[PDB]
Nucleic acid binder design. Structure first.
Ligand SMILES: Nc1ncnc2c1ncn2[C@@H]1O[C@H](COP(=O)(O)OP(=O)(O)OP(=O)(O)O)[C@@H](O)[C@H]1O
Lengths: 614, 443
DNA sequence: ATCGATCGATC
DNA sequence: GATCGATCGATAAAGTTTTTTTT
């Protein structure tokens, strides 16, 4: 009587696929969304569906959707039969799956006793210690070679590695098998562990866990180490007796009841597990809006006023961080050197000032950009250093805030308090884009494509004026020449600037005084530079002859003698002298370089090298 | 069936009748040359592979291995007319396949990839030695016919039966010792090399089963990439996880090549040709009988850097090398040349060493801090759970022409520099820390 | 050495 | 054809002082 009930829910779901759940006509929301679900599928060939719990609850008014919530451990090989019937009548090698999502409620892992056998229950948590990608079987072509091995049984169970039922002729049944790798189609899966979220533990009371199984295309979508949700079918799996290997406290005490099956007397257990079907991980005219916004005029000056509300003034350093926010060029000469790919700018200043606000600003504003103080200069992190032999091997790679800044903008501060050894290590990491390691293992060829951001401390907390920063750099010489220039933030105590900064901070520190207007928003600026990165402007004019005389004049200035200091701005900086010069034209969306654009390029070192040169 | 018999006729024509790039019989020339060295190998050109897949894409990505078995027997007749009686020595040939237009890492494998051609990279971890493999199972009964012919044993499946074509009893099958040849077998397991990988995560494992004339081409520690087929072995028994409807993974191989560098090419410098057969060796003499070559080569060696001349005189001289001239029962002679640069911070000294790493044949780039005082030379890695203290060398035993950067890592300068200045003085240095007294040879 | 499973023989 | 008896095959084991880099 559940056969016709299974046949009732077969067509009632099929009739639901004939209709839509569309409430608005031609104000958006085109009708018959499930027909278009078939239409997108017959082009890209992904072999999925996507159904929600809402629109099937609001057709039979819960007379049908409440039935499948307690039975679809059995009803799951029923609804697949109906959609397999409707696909030939509506569309032209075909394996599918049933992907519910978005049930209303969300539980924790501590609430699974008796109703959770055959139900659907969305479960939160985090995920740790994944595994690999192996194939599964679900259907055999195996049969004995007595007379003919073409018997195709199906539905290999949790231990059924032996299809031995109903041969064609009266051959030797259950005598043998031969698992054909030809016709028996497979599917791919993995087995990962989960863990409970941090904001629910009462105390440090050994937070328990369980294990899941991902079956369909859902493999590799579950990035480990994030807050995540799941589908919710439950299952129990024993495995103690098979053909191969021979199968504390009184765990498995219920197993003694489970004895005496029709095959050999044993002690079969039953351990709780979990199966999923679908994962999620929480945590036009807009394309025409860029074409309107690219046809503006003063966007170089519009953007610099609209960077950060937590800062006032300092219009020199606001220009520099925006060029750091975008990227330059990286394509270079053939068969050999890969040149620079970016700029690297620092600002030193007195602590507990407006230096710390940009560092707060960028790490949410930038894609995947990490922040690290860089004080733990002992174990790992900034310094790269492998881990000891653990669980099957030494010489394994480690994390740290350079490798995961691959096209990411890392920011480290406090240069003074590190040791004397890493100051060549990151100096190696700065000049080209790879680092090398050979500590007790083979050489490693890893290429952290990075662009750093720095803020060190002065030698006394107050910057002197009449001297240079050659004393006040508080480090060695050649890393500064390896670096770009700075535009150090100055300080003063005037009667006027403190008053306006006081008014600048109180409306910010209001709960709601949003009268300040940045002429852009955050995200429309964010997608704007994503349009800006898709060019490659090349200098084509003959202003390179104009270019070479400026540096040739420039090098005769900072060298104030044959015995003058070794801060001689050499041919290393000429690459930055053009790779910033293209990037500022890459901001204004111009695909070639004019001599007018490099006017702001020349003085930007030069106004800041006269900051060096007294 | 029977139309595959004509397939061998349909490709021996389609291969041997013409080779591209203005004829010259390129593939028709490299056959006899590897016949001369007696080394049992062939190649296929990718552009020929691009042209010999038009009717064969549905016979490469559909059926990769039994297409090759019928592809193997035509190559005998492709050279039997050329070299007669070559089958009387070693009686066997098998082909190898060159590069392929895929870039698969270790992570990206699914069900659609199996029983087809695959290509993947990684690094070689812990490896075994060389065993012989039976390869021709002359089956043996006890009372009936005890010679069932030399079989064709598979991979790790132990292909046998209880009784067939003699009786139906439980008489087991045994062995005997007449004329069973052996190929060898060497199961390198592979770890994913931490290059192109989203970092901060774990490595992943596979297994690789090599074959007969491809043994010990790799060395432990060195980066390799492999081109072969994919296979499955549903053994129905696994004991790390529970027994489950799953199946393992075995990657058999057809070819193997060394680490590559500057992966930006389109048609060259990824396949190690290095095969100076006709168009090169006939050419390379007149380029040697000119009058200003040494004034031309070292000027044209490092093209990207104009600079002062004398370094390019020296650094070209360094990788050209001298001679390890041995002598009678007396002291040996160093056959090496060891330059040392000194530069201002900002001249091009970091690039010539970077560029010469590509233009060499083998190299290493242990630079700066983190170079261990022992990890350059050989070190002993401790045993796993039932093993012995074995010897697993690091940088200098692998590199014959290695490149270090000993500038001023002063905190570790008093550690490692007592272990590099006896690689030159008492050349071929090795050590016996808590292990075996041995002496490896590293020039 | 003991227990379980499979095969053969007898009713 | 089914049931009972006899013979053959498969099933049970255990760890925690020296030595490496590292902080
Ligand atoms: N003579 C030159 N010709 C061409 N390019 C040069 C020259 N000198 C320096 N450069 C450029 O300057 C860039 C900076 O790298 P550089 O070679 O100066 O590092 P380095 O100072 O040698 O580093 P280290 O001192 O650590 O070895 C290089 O990418 C290189 O292209």
């Amino acid at each position: 009587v559940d056969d016709v009930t299974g046949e009732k829910v077969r067509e009632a779901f099929e009739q639901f696929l004939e209709d839509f759940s569309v409430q608005s006509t031609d104000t958006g929301e085109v009708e018959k969304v499930y027909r278009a679900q078939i239409e997108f599928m017959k082009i890209y060939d992904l072999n999925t569906i996507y159904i929600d719990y809402q629109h099937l609850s609001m057709r039979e008014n819960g007379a049908l959707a409440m039935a499948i919530s307690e039975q679809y451990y059995r009803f799951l090989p029923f609804l697949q039969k109906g959609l397999r019937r409707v696909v030939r009548k509506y569309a032209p090698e075909r394996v599918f799956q049933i992907s519910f999502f978005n049930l209303p409620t969300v539980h924790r892992i501590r609430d699974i006793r008796s109703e959770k056998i055959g139900s659907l229950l969305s479960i939160s948590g985090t995920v740790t210690r994944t595994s690999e990608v192996r194939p599964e079987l679900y259907k055999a072509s195996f049969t004995c070679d007595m007379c003919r091995a073409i018997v195709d049984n199906v539905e290999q169970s949790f231990k059924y590695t032996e299809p031995t039922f109903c041969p064609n002729p009266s051959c030797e049944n259950r005598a043998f098998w031969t698992l054909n790798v030809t016709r028996s189609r497979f599917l791919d899966w993995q087995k990962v562990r989960i863990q409970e979220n941090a904001n629910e533990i009462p105390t440090g009371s050994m937070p328990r866990t369980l294990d899941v199984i991902l079956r369909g295309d859902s493999v590799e979508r579950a990035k480990p180490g994030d807050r995540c949700k799941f589908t919710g079918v439950e299952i129990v799996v024993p495995d103690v007796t098979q053909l191969g290997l021979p199968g504390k406290t009184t765990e498995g005490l219920n197993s003694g009841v489970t004895g005496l099956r029709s095959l050999g007397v044993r002690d079969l257990t039953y351990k709780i597990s979990f199966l999923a079907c679908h994962v999620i991980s929480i945590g036009s005219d807009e394309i025409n809006e860029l074409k309107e916004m690219v046809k503006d005029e003063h966007i170089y000056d519009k953007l610099v006023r609209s960077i950060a509300p937590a800062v006032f003034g300092h219009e020199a350093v606001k220009k520099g961080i925006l060029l750091q926010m975008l990227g330059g060029v990286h394509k270079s000469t053939v068969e050999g050197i890969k040149l620079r790919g970016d700029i690297n700018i620092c600002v030193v200043g007195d602590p507990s000032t407006s230096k710390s606000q940009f560092l707060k600003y960028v790490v949410g504003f930038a894609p995947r950009s990490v922040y690290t103080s860089g004080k733990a200069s002992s174990a790992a992190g900034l310094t790269a250093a492998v881990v000891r032999d653990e669980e099957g091997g030494d010489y394994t790679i480690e994390a740290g805030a350079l490798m995961l800044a691959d096209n990411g903008i890392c920011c480290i501060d406090e240069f003074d308090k590190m040791d004397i050894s890493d100051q060549v290590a990151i100096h190696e990491a700065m000049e080209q884009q790879t680092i090398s390691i050979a500590k007790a293992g083979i050489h490693a060829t890893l290429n952290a494509r990075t662009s750093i951001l720095a803020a060190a401390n002065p030698v006394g907390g107050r910057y002197n004026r009449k001297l240079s920063l050659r004393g006040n750099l508080n480090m060695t010489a050649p890393i500064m020449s390896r670096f770009d220039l700075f535009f150090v933030i100055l300080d003063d105590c005037n009667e006027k600037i403190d008053t306006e900064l006081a008014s600048h901070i109180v409306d910010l520190h209001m709960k709601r005084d949003e009268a300040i207007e940045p002429p852009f928003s955050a995200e429309q600026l964010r997608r704007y530079i994503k349009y800006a990165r898709t060019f490659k402007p090349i200098l084509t004019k003959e202003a390179r002859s104009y270019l070479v005389e400026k540096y040739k004049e420039l090098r005769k200035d900072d060298a104030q003698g044959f015995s003058r200091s070794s801060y001689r701005i050499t041919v290393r900086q000429l690459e930055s002298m053009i790779r910033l010069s293209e990037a500022i034209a890459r901001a204004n969306c111009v695909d070639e370089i004019t001599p007018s654009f490099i006017a702001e390029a020349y003085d930007l070192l030069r106004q800041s090298i006269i900051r060096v040169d007294v | 069936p029977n139309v595959s018999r004509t397939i061998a006729r349909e490709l021996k024509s389609f291969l041997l009748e013409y080779t591209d790039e203005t004829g010259r019989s390129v593939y028709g020339a490299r056959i006899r040359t590897l016949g001369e060295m007696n080394s049992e190998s062939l190649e296929v050109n990718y552009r020929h592979l691009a042209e010999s897949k038009a009717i064969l894409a549905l016979f490469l990505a559909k059926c990769p291995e039994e297409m090759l078995k019928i592809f193997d027997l035509v190559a005998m007749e492709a050279t039997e007319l050329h070299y007669p009686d070559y089958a009387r020595i070693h009686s066997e040939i098998h082909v190898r396949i060159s590069d392929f237009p895929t870039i698969y890492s270790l992570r990206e494998l699914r069900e659609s990839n199996l029983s087809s051609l695959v290509r993947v990279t990684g690094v070689v971890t812990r490896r075994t030695g060389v065993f012989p493999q039976l390869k021709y199972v002359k089956f043996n009964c006890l009372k009936c016919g005890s010679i069932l012919g030399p079989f064709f044993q598979d991979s790790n499946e132990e292909i046998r039966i209880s009784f067939c074509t003699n009786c139906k009893s439980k008489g087991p099958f045994r062995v005997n010792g007449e004329k069973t040849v052996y190929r060898n077998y060497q199961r390198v397991t592979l770890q994913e090399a931490p290059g192109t990988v989203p970092p901060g995560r774990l490595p992943r494992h596979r297994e690789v089963i090599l074959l007969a004339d491809l043994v010990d081409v790799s060395k432990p520690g060195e980066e390799v990439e492999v081109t072969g087929i994919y296979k499955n072995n549903y053994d129905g028994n696994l004991n790390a996880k529970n027994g489950f409807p799953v199946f393992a993974t075995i990657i058999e191989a057809n070819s193997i090549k060394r680490r590559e560098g500057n992966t930006a090419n389109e048609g060259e410098e990824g396949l190690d040709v290095f095969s100076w057969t006709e168009e090169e060796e006939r050419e390379f003499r007149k380029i040697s009988r000119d009058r200003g070559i040494i004034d031309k080569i070292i000027s044209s060696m490092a093209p990207s850097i104009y600079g002062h001349r004398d370094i390019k005189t020296a650094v070209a001289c360094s990788l050209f090398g001298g001679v390890p001239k041995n002598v009678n029962g007396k002291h040996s002679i160093r056959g090496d040349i060891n330059v040392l640069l000194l530069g201002d911070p900002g001249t091009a000294k970091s690039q010539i060493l970077k560029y010469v790493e590509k233009t060499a044949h083998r190299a290493v780039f242990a630079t700066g801090q983190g170079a261990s005082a022992v990890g350059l030379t050989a070190s002993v890695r401790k045993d796993p759970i039932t093993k012995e203290w074995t010897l697993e060398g690091g940088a200098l035993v692998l590199a014959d022409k290695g490149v270090c950067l000993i500038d001023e890592f002063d905190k570790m300068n008093d550690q490692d520099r007592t272990s590099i200045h006896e690689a030159m003085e008492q050349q071929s240095i090795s050590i016996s820390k808590a292990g075996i007294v041995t002496t490896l040879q590293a020039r």
